Amino acid sequence: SFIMYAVCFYWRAYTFEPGMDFGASAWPQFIQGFAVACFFMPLTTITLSGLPPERLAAASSLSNFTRTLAGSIGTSITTTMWTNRESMHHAQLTESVNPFNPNAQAMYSQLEGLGMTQQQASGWIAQQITNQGLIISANEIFWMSAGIFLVLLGLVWFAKPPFG
Amino acid sequence: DQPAVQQAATEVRNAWLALERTRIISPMTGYVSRRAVQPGAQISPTTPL
Numbered sequence: 001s002f003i004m005y006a007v008c009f010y011w012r013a014y015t016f017e018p019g020m021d022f023g024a025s026a027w028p029q030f031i032q033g034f035a036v037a038c039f040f041m042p043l044t045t046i047t048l049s050g051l052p053p054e055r056l057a058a059a060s061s062l063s064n065f066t067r068t069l070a071g072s073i074g075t076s077i078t079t080t081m082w083t084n085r086e087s088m089h090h091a092q093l094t095e096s097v098n099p100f101n102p103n104a105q106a107m108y109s110q111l112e113g114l115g116m117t118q119q120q121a122s123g124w125i126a127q128q129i130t131n132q133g134l135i136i137s138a139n140e141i142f143w144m145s146a147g148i149f150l151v152l153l154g155l156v157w158f159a160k161p162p163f164g
Numbered sequence: 165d166q167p168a169v170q171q172a173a174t175e176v177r178n179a180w181l182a183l184e185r186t187r188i189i190s191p192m193t194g195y196v197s198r199r200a201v202q203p204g205a206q207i208s209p210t211t212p213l
Binding site for chain 1: 198199200212
């Protein structure tokens with residue numbers, strides 16, 4: 001399951017594009033189906049292995065508490081990383097948009113062809129840069145997640161086999 | 165010093181300044197950063213160089 005989760009995230013990393021159809025973000029989840037399927041049942045069977053029937057409640061409570069904490073932490077980290085890396089990419093992109101550059105005055109000419117003002121055209125270019133940065137930053141997070149998965153692989157082997 | 169002759173002298177001066185300005189001079193000591201001018205380009209007084 002860990003290997004399958006790394007595969008899915010690397011799949012998303014090298015295939016996201018501005019003009020991607022609905023199918024480009026539907027195959028990776030079809031693959032992630034396997035990874036999710038074989039992660040909850042086995043790991044939960046290991047988690048509650050060998051404990052007496054009476055204590056199953058407390059163990060379940062502890063497991064759920066830890067899992068919810070992990071979910072909240074993950075959301076908190078990921079959102080901030082997404083926005084901050086978007087800002088960094090925005091900074092690195094807006095540099096190219098200056099005078100002294102063909103295929104930069106041409107864009108302004110085509111924009112003014114449609115009747116937009118100069119300020120409106122500038123805003124439109126800024127919005128496009130923002131969108132590209134979000135896609136790049138979003139794909140940088142997926143790559144990091146898959147890499148992190150590759151290391152978490154081997155920890156599951158430290159558990160003894162008393163399963164039952 | 166006659167009025168008629170001086171009128172034409174003014175036009176001569178304007179034309180001469182026009183010709184002397186075909187050479188573009190640097191107004192400040194410094195270093196060149198961007199260069200968007202190539203031989204054969206068509207230049208107006210609104211095109212950065």
